């Protein structure tokens, strides 16, 4: 494509939403606060505005990255693939742990789409490049690849990952988790990757840690000199309660 793209266009009211959610985040998290929300939006708009939405690079986002620097405890990181709801619910109940989307930068961009045009200097609300059909180097795809690499690269000690046990590929080598995150876990820093395979909750009494795609993930991590551990969440409807109440006798019966 050239000016007409295959993907949804910039989220309606994008500029207001970014600034709005930047203020809510910087009030609620004073350890930052030094941050100027008008300044971060300038750095974010600057990354893609008046640029060709198929020629965007990591460097375009460096301004934004510097303004959004945040050290998250490296030992409290949760990665996730396809099971977005339970991942974020988990960090809402276990409030010392973080997903990418609980950081300032991840929080700004979550569920939003954005792109510009080669010169019009306007935001394109009509359409934006689709990763598959249009081009991989688009404002949205390049943003998530850059923040996701940094997030995984910082992780230390025990890193957790939540996977969707109801997908045909529980571990997907072509996901951001499979492509970027797993190859940026440093064995000098990381002792263990521990996977949680969330069952669809109906009937899947199978040990999904023996799934061939989990065996593939295990081999990748093992070759990085990191310990791979894997457990099943058979009852997602009881998971949050059991994490907070590990001495409840209805939780321990799962051994």
């Amino acid at each position, epitope marked *: 494509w050239r000016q007409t793209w295959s993907g949804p266009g910039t989220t309606k009211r994008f500029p207001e939403t970014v600034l709005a959610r930047c203020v809510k985040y910087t009030e609620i998290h004073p350890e930052m606060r030094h941050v100027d929300c008008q300044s971060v939006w300038d750095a974010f708009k600057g990354a893609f505005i008046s640029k060709h939405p198929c020629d965007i690079t990591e460097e375009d986002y460096q301004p934004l990255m510097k303004l959004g620097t945040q050290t998250v405890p490296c030992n409290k990181i949760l990665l996730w693939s396809r099971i977005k709801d339970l991942a974020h619910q988990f960090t809402q109940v276990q409030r010392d742990m973080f997903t990418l989307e609980d950081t300032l930068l991840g929080y700004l961009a979550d569920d939003l789409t954005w792109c510009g045009e080669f010169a019009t200097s306007k935001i394109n609300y009509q359409s934006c490049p689709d990763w598959r059909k249009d081009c991989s180097n688009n404002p949205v795809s390049v943003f998530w690849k850059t923040v996701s690499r940094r997030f995984a690269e910082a992780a230390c000690d025990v890193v957790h990952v939540m996977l969707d046990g109801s997908r045909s590929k529980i571990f997907d080598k072509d996901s951001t988790f499979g492509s970027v995150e797993v190859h940026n876990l440093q064995p000098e820093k990381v002792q263990t990757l521990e996977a949680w395979v969330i069952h669809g909750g109906r009937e899947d009494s199978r040990d999904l840690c023996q799934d061939p795609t989990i065996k593939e993930l295990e081999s990748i991590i093992s070759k990085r000199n990191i310990q791979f*551990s894997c457990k099943n*969440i058979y009852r997602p409807d009881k998971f949050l309660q059991c994490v907070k109440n*590990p001495e409840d006798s209805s939780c321990t019966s799962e*051994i």
Partner: nanobody, 124 residues
């Protein structure tokens, strides 16, 4: 040669203390959560306690809380259970078991490896 070997079981009177040991070999003990599970002769298994790989998490069944302490020595690859104020109802074969993961976040799944257990008898 993944192995767990429990020691310390015997016959004690109510009110006394007993320390159990569980010697681990054949795997990186210091990277796994560890459990104690007990089974009174003729009765169903009862989960007793869990300790995370780093010892930061220690959790206990309501039936032993305040009387039993779980601990580990990652240099000796040994798990312990310190039992105090023992009761007749504490009589059981005590097993140590290896978690699939770390239990820094307590997530309960099937335990992969079990010891042979050590019988503890509390009888006047």
């Amino acid at each position: 040669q993944v192995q767990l070997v429990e020691s310390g079981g015997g016959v004690v009177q109510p009110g006394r203390s007993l320390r159990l040991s569980c010697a681990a070999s054949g795997f990186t003990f210091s990277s796994y959560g560890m459990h104690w599970v007990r089974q009174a002769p003729g009765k169903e298994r009862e989960w007793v306690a869990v300790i995370s790989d780093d010892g930061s998490n220690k959790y206990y069944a309501d039936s032993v809380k305040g009387r039993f302490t779980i601990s580990r020595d990652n240099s000796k690859n040994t798990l312990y259970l310190q039992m105090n104020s023992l009761r007749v109802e504490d009589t059981a074969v005590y097993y140590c078991a290896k978690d699939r993961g770390t239990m820094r976040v307590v997530v309960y799944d099937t335990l992969d490896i079990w010891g042979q257990g050590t019988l503890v008898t509390v009888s006047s």
